[PDB]
Design a protein around this ligand. Structure first.
Ligand SMILES: [Zn+2]
Ligand SMILES: [Zn+2]
Lengths: 7, 56
């Protein structure tokens, strides 16, 4: 996986 | 596969810098590759630190 970003 | 043995890639070290590397063995379960570098050294590099050294 990568980085979890919020919307 | 997006990654394969013998593929030329760009890998990020802990310094944050990209180095030309060559993939030697891929472990898809751990998202990790063996990558060898111009000094013949070998490291295990997380997939998130690997990008192909070639545009699609
Ligand atoms: Zn993943
Ligand atoms: Zn050598």
């Amino acid at each position: 996986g990568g980085v979890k970003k919020p919307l | 596969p997006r990654l394969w043995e013998g593929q030329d890639v760009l890998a990020r070290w802990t310094d944050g810098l990209l180095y030309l590397g060559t993939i030697k063995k891929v472990d898809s379960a751990r998202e990790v590759c063996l990558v060898q570098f111009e000094d013949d050294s070998q490291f295990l590099v997380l997939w998130k630190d690997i990008s192909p050294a070639a545009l699609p």
